[PDB]
């Protein structure tokens, strides 16, 4: 069962700065990694699919990259609305699994 490591668990950044969340898979999973955003009291929301594919309705500020075992979710010019929990999820091998989560702090 594929383990997804998200470290650090909390990330602090200054308004407008560039931020990067990391997700590490216990074994090579191509680019079968997806990112979700969950604001306080909200349900998860798909941000990036297959490591770097854009989703319609998501600010162009968000981008992903990586392949194999290391993945990055990036936000260029962070802002208040980005404060939330960010999760990665893999679909390479059954069963699907989720990372532990990374909190964005401004």
């Amino acid at each position: 069962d594929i383990l997804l490591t998200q470290s650090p668990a909390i990330l602090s950044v200054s308004p407008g700065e560039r931020v990067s969340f990391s997700c590490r898979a216990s074994q090579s999973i191509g680019t079968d990694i997806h990112w979700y955003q969950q604001r306080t009291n909200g349900s998860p929301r798909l941000l990036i699919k297959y490591a770097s594919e854009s989703i319609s309705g998501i600010p162009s500020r968000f981008s992903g990259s990586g392949s194999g075992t290391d993945f990055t979710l990036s936000i260029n010019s962070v802002e208040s609305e980005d404060i939330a929990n960010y999760y990665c999820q893999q679909s390479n091998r059954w069963p699907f699994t989720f990372g532990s989560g990374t909190k964005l702090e401004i």
Partner: protein, 103 residues
């Protein structure tokens, strides 16, 4: 209309159906098995084509009993389909060469 050409077509249509159903069933059979990779439809379809043509790269393959049984049906349908096309090409050449001799 020439049977060998009709059977060739029927063979192609049938193969396309086997590929789609095989893709569907492979996913249905492999989910639930820890470690399985044949679990999303787009790649499952690539896998089926990969199997039917007998290329078998090894990037994807079934690990469950029913996934393997589905795989066998796909291999056989592909081998039979392409084999039937070859047979039809043989009948066309044989028939035409007969003409080239008069008959």
């Amino acid at each position: 209309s020439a049977l060998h050409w009709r059977a060739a077509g029927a063979a192609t249509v049938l193969l396309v159906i086997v590929l789609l159903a095989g893709s569907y069933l492979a996913v249905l059979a492999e989910r639930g098995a820890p470690g399985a990779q044949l679990i999303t439809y787009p790649r499952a379809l690539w896998w089926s084509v990969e199997t039917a043509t007998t290329v078998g790269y090894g990037d994807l393959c079934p690990v469950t009993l029913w996934g393997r049984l589905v795989a066998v049906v796909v291999m056989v349908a592909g081998i039979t389909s392409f084999g039937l096309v070859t047979a039809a090409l043989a009948t066309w050449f044989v028939g035409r060469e007969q003409e080239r001799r008069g008959h």
